[PDB]
Subunit: 370 residues, 3 copies
């Protein structure tokens, strides 16, 4: 969808209505922790709005230029195993960005950093809104410097007519109750979000592609903006329950993937053009390394980069992973020292590592995170 | 496919061959009721032919302009639940039109209205033929006022060379026998039709898209017109067995959806621009309402409109639904009375309500159907 | 991918690296038969390279003009049953060409014809490489006389930077060990290859379609060429194990399909324009015939044509099929005798019939193969 850097536009309308929806549908029986966390979120509405529009205007989204249109099966295809060369990091998808930003928001909320938690939650909802956008051509025709297309600017002009204020039921029944059933957030999210995204692709073909009339486009905007608002209210309800009840979604499960979220210092020359690798060592002395490389320019000064790693040994638990590190390898003969500010490592929806570094890494060097 | 308003063209050839196929393959052991109903259908061939081409030339198909090309997974995506905002009616698909017109044909046949039953059966086969048409671009390039494209007009010129006169086996064996196995018509139809539609999408990419040669196009027309004729013969065989044996496909199952087929009187000003809602009330006093809104202009004078409703409570049987109604809500301050001629409600492949109304509904009023 | 008729280019690089990969990853425990067959393959590298590029420059690929881009679900859709008119032969797909050429290579290797076996194996890998090529528009824009597109010529210029030399593990662990688990080669191949092809379609939409930048294209070439090389090393490892251990993948299973690979003599006028049919007769006297017809010109002088037949009776074993034949039917009144040189029939991954003919077939005649 469209949105503006000041926290206005379609994206901000969707998360604003998501909270309004929950306030209207919130059952009388919901626990007081959930009701109290909803009021903290309401206090931080402006951050939720900024978060919701930010990803289209971030720099780190690899110089470029933004395109937030994926085939709905991308995430599923990338999860398969066999079909990915394991030494390469997996690219970000709208599906994986929802999970990463969700894990970050839960982590921040729990340590009492509500401003930052809500900004991250907004960013998760941005990507959910994008995967529900009914636009799936092979070749994109962008009309602005932030990578939006005409269907989104058309909906933007008309956004106020598509607002909804209830999902049709209270949070003790059907839609909302089914969202709490699966404890594994990542597993739930993958299936839940995929349903909305596939319906958006069907609607692209039947009503929103460029050959369709303006009436069809208006209809496509109405139904997909109502699906966006409903799906968004569902994520927010799930979020409130997870942080109120102190749910850990990672509890017990194998570690198939690890996600690194790396913040490079804003200091002049802190970025690097050398090869960077992430590595682990398990309890039984087996190791795995990965290349950290996304399409654009990785590890630029002041960037926040995301790398997703697929494990070869699928039977591991988080507690089996004893050590982790980052390793630099010189690309040229000329020094290009690297200064990370902080690294967060996420496994099954939990931030398991949050380490401030703020040290220069030079030459061919291995920096131990743990 | 192409077709003409007088019951000629590719569509009419497909249903004509569908009956010819069944006459050739009809086993010696088929019951006399099936054989007798086949002769009544043969007597009404002209209606089957008109029905088969009519939907491209109907008005109510929302002013417009017609496009009968859907992604094969549309129906499946729309059935999911979670991914549809329940207050909105679901849009018609080629898949859902086959089920609606099939239910109407069975209903009419059983009350001895063979002309009308066969016209409805033709209309069901029109939509099956369309979903088997190998044309699935994101953007459609229509070449006539009825929304046809060049692949269909190319096949139209060559239609007589693609005719088949047998599916390769008798109705006591394989293809035909498997069609009778599943008693739930709607469930069978969904899976059966989807196989032909997906094969049509594969063939679109390998042989029928515009970059392919004329030889490839001819091959695509040959195989997909033979699949259309075979699939059509199968539906007709299933129809003959269902009406001969007095099968009820709705028997026992939960009501997940309700379909309203509304005929608005042809009387001047009978149509309306006010908001229209459909509603039910179950045995335990729980209610649900839906907005009736399709992309074009709903409830126009003399129109026959179709609305598909998704139930929130998935455990209901037909006999649990005690009352149903339609409710009007004024859009402007100026009167715009509405006059329906008849409403048919369909649940799991059965016409459960068939009520003649022919009364003016005004103001903000609730009209009880039952 | 691109490639040249002299056994150079991207395709040849992929199969060359596939062997290099296996040499690096080959476990110390692999049996000496596997190690010895790898050295015979290394001796025949030039044939593996020629095989890998040949299919883009063959004539029989039906005059035309080549297009090796399929939707990933094509093979799966064609296997369904119900959705194919059984009297017509099924068209070739990248998926089915991998299976056909694999069966031919295994057959040749076993009779000691290593040159020809390795050339066939190359041809199987050509088609695997194509289905892993991330290019899936509805309409193709070819830029050379062999049907290549700009994404492939762009990767061709840069091919040397994308080479990999290991899959990341030894052949005693994970990736490689899972490849030997399923004994039914055809079943394994269908699922294995489909994973790579679906990932290629996702990458087409996110990075390789024409609207994406050059950086995105470079990234798409890197990951998909590494997937091609990895998948290719896996097929080659499977091949070495199947021929070393004398595996029969057909053992026990029902015959759902039969594949005919027909070589027409190079003699002047050996080809034919008459209708050609293939037929069988089972132990219980039941027969089935099929039309042999592909989109282009079938049975041209010196051609090697492939026809895939779907059986109606799905419960048959290979030993139930007693007789097979080819039947000619005059198209015109003027003689057009046909001279086949050899017919190979393949069932579940085994060459079950290999008959030299080299006899003229005239008029309306049935030629018994067995
Ligand atoms: Zn957006
Ligand atoms: Zn976006
Ligand atoms: Zn049509
Ligand atoms: Zn139509
Ligand atoms: Zn190629
Ligand atoms: Zn090729």
């Amino acid at each position: 969808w469209d949105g503006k850097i000041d926290g206005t536009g379609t994206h901000a309308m969707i998360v604003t209505q998501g909270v309004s929806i929950l306030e209207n549908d919130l059952s009388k029986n919901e626990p007081e922790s959930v009701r109290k966390n909803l009021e903290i979120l309401k206090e931080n509405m402006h951050e939720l709005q900024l978060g919701s529009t930010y990803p289209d205007y971030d720099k780190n989204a690899y110089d470029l230029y933004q395109d937030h249109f994926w085939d709905p099966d991308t995430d599923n295809n990338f999860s398969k195993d066999n079909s990915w060369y394991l030494a390469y990091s997996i690219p970000d998808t709208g599906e994986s960005q929802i999970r990463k930003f969700s894990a970050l928001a839960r982590y921040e909320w729990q340590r009492g950093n509500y401003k930052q938690a809500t900004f991250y939650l907004g960013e998760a909802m941005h990507y959910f809104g994008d995967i529900d956008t009914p636009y799936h051509p092979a070749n994109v025709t962008a009309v602005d410097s932030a990578g939006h297309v005409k269907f989104e600017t058309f909906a933007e002009e008309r956004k106020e007519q598509y607002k909804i204020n209830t999902v049709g039921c209270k949070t003790n029944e059907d839609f909302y109750a089914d969202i709490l059933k699966n404890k594994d957030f990542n597993a739930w999210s993958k299936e839940y979000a995929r349903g909305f995204a596939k319906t958006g692709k069907s609607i692209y073909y039947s009503h929103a592609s460029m050959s369709h009339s303006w009436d069809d486009w208006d209809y496509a905007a109405k139904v997909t903006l109502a699906n966006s608002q409903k799906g968004t209210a569902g994520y927010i309800y799930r979020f409130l329950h997870d942080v109120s009840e102190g749910n850990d979604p990672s509890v017990g499960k194998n570690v198939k993937e690890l996600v690194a979220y790396i913040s490079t210092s804003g200091e002049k020359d802190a970025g690097t053009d050398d090869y960077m690798y992430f590595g682990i060592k398990t309890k039984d002395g087996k190791t795995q390394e990965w290349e950290m490389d996304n399409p654009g320019n990785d590890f630029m000064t002041g960037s926040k980069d995301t790398y997703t790693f697929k494990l070869k040994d699928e039977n591991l638990k988080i507690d089996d992973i004893q050590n982790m590190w980052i390793r630099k390898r010189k690309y040229t003969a000329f020094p290009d020292a690297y200064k990370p500010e902080n690294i967060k490592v996420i496994a099954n929806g939990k931030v398991v590592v949050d380490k401030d570094i703020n040290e220069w890494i030079s030459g061919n060097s291995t920096y131990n995170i743990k």
